[PDB]
Amino acid sequence: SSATSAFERMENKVLDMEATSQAAGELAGFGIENQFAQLEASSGVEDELAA
Amino acid sequence: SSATSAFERMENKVLDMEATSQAAGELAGFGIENQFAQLEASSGVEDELAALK
Amino acid sequence: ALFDRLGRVVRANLNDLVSKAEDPEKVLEQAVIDMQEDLVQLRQAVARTIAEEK
Amino acid sequence: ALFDRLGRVVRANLNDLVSKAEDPEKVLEQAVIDMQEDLVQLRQAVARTIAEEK
Amino acid sequence: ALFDRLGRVVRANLNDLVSKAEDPEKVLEQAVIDMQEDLVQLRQAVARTIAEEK
Amino acid sequence: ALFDRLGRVVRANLNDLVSKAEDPEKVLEQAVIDMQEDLVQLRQAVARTIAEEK
Amino acid sequence: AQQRTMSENLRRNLAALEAKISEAKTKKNMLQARAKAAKANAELQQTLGGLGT
Amino acid sequence: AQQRTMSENLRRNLAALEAKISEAKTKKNMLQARAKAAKANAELQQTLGGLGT
Amino acid sequence: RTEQRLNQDTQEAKKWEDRAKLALTNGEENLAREALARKKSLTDTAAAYQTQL
Amino acid sequence: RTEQRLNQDTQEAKKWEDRAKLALTNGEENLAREALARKKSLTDTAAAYQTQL
Amino acid sequence: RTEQRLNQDTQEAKKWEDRAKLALTNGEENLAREALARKKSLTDTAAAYQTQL
Numbered sequence A: 001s002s003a004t005s006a007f008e009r010m011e012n013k014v015l016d017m018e019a020t021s022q023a024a025g026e027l028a029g030f031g032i033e034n035q036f037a038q039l040e041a042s043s044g045v046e047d048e049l050a051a
Numbered sequence B: 001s002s003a004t005s006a007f008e009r010m011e012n013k014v015l016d017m018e019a020t021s022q023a024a025g026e027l028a029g030f031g032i033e034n035q036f037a038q039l040e041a042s043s044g045v046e047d048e049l050a051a052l053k
Numbered sequence C, D, E, F: 001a002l003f004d005r006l007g008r009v010v011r012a013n014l015n016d017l018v019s020k021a022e023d024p025e026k027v028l029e030q031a032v033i034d035m036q037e038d039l040v041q042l043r044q045a046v047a048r049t050i051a052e053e054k
Numbered sequence G, H: 001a002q003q004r005t006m007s008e009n010l011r012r013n014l015a016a017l018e019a020k021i022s023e024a025k026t027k028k029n030m031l032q033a034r035a036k037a038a039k040a041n042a043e044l045q046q047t048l049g050g051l052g053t
Numbered sequence I, J, K: 001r002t003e004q005r006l007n008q009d010t011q012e013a014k015k016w017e018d019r020a021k022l023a024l025t026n027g028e029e030n031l032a033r034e035a036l037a038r039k040k041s042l043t044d045t046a047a048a049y050q051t052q053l
């Protein structure tokens, strides 16, 4: 009946693929930071350069 | 026959099984340190060269 | 102690056989349906106490 | 007394047998079940007591 | 001890027989299968551990 | 060791008989169909979480 | 006065119940999605994994 | 006065037992995790180990 | 089909490219990042389709 | 296949090199350190394939 | 085939020696001792292999 046991079955089944989270975690963080950060800069320099 | 005595009996069993696995690894030929220390030292000097440049 | 331990082993094994056989997604779905039924019954009960208050 | 000692040996062997038959996973969980089943009953006694005090 | 030595000879002969019956192609591949089947189970234990830490 | 080696030989041979009998093009085709079915089920699931978000 | 405070407490219990069920429904659906995602991942791990039919 | 003196004693004891049961149920979960990890560790060390035939 | 997907993303890249330069032609500051990010994602996808193609 | 594995791992090592230097530039030491360890690990994997090739 | 294992135990011995050196360069006087011992064992094995070859 447990919602938690339903979670645990899913947690088990979606694991073999290897989800330690060493990979994904690090990657996304820095990516979004410099990605959206670079988009701000770029956009603002284009807005104040090309006119 | 109490619930807690059953709980303690299985708890001690589980802890022994953890210890057994640990010991088995050491007897088999531990290898979860000699490599870690090397990786650490190597990445250490790599960090220094990266920071420098 | 012998038969008290025996009972604990038997109940544990029987409950594991039940845990094995059932599928918790179907049970979780069924459970949410039952909680929703109870919610409706409580809504009706609340309406009745409001009606008596009025 | 040799009779009693024979009985001791037999009980010891049976105790060891039912201990060996345990699986920590099932039994530890079963023990918790028993704790919760017992607690419910005590809560019902305290429930009555609180009502009587009122 | 001649009995044990006879048994040794018989086990040795059977061991040699099942070794000869191996085909590296099938068996090497089968061994890898066993490695992966074992690894999956350990991953599921580590899966639980990570959830409990969270 | 004798029967452990025997088991490995038997499983290897059985899996080879399966590998022989099947045609991997038909299986690869069937597999892609099954992956496409799973993709649709995940699309529906994604739509449901978007719906709840909304 | 007695009916109003009784009804109020009961209404509070109803609100709490409904909120918890809404939560449960949300969590149930995201678990279904994660289960289906895992199943999809398994089929790719199979077809695009190692060797076999 | 008698009812209040006794019903408060019972509440202290219930509270202690509640702390006790919840201790066991959170331990139950982490112990089951620890046990499963130990079991798995032992099997992999034996299988990937070169000892035995 | 790979050609078509590549081209489609090129067209979609220009749709977000004009919006990015427009916000930047008004001396706005916080609009550009949205359109630029969308264009960047689409050109990365087009790159992958280029390799594939 | 060995040639392909070698090249792919080399390319991954370079991607993590870039991430390390970007993390370093942002001023986050820890991610730079870890990324250089990942770079080394992928280089080591590539090295193994090089010898194998 | 004998020659192969000989030449390979040689490389393993060199690896263990280098690890002992690196450990001694980091201030760890425990790992280096075990590494030297493993190298000694493998060099004994290499000696015997050379003789039989």
Ligand SMILES: Nc1ncnc2c1ncn2[C@@H]1O[C@H](COP(=O)(O)OP(=O)(O)O)[C@@H](O)[C@H]1O
Pocket (backbone or CB within 6 Å): A016, A017, E029, E032, E033, E036, E037, E039, E040, G045, G046, G049, G050, G051, G052
């Ligand atoms: N020769 C093979 N190589 C890899 N996988 C295989 C092979 N034969 C069958 N398989 C199947 O593919 C799966 C590989 O196991 P898995 O743990 O997913 O790989 P990994 O450990 O590399 O992630 C197994 O479940 C097995 O059923």
